Amino acid sequence: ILEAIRDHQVVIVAGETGSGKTTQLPKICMELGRGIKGLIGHTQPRRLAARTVANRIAEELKTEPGGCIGYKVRFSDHVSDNTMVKLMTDGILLAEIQQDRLLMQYDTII
RNA sequence: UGCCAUGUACGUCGCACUCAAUAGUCAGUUUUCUGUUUUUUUUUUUUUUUUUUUUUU
């Protein structure tokens, strides 16, 4: 997967219910080096799912949520300046497209 | 206020009520339903009814 994301501009991953690709892919972007110049936007279809995966990877990296890896859903602006992974619902990204058309805040969109 | 010449012709009769009775002509297969009273009123205005599912500076 790391070779795929360092060799392709578009990567696609397929996984079952017990895979963990959702958990590991932001850490794969970390091991490449993404997150530094621009945030890593991970889109989730559900608020509880986005909250759970953000807190899960924060606990896995032994950081409190709202630090390195934080989630933005409706009025949970739970992101500090030292973030690099940003959870968001497709609607929240739909809100940010008009705020910045170029998606310049991010470098990786999951 | 005196007189008035003579003889001169008769008979009998009829009418009514009525009139009756007559020629010939044999037969018609068996079986059937149809049939009767009685309580009477038939008829009365109604109602609210269920739910995949998921995201938005």
Swiss-Prot record:
Gene name, Swiss-Prot/TrEMBL: hrpA
Organism: Escherichia coli (strain K12)
Residue sites binding ATP per the record: G15, E16, T17, G18, S19, G20, K21, T22
Span of domain Helicase ATP-binding: 2-110
Role, per record: Not yet known.
Lineage: Bacteria, Pseudomonadati, Pseudomonadota, Gammaproteobacteria, Enterobacterales
Protein name: ATP-dependent RNA helicase HrpA
Entry similarity comment: Belongs to the DEAD box helicase family. DEAH subfamily.
Top-level taxon of origin: Bacteria
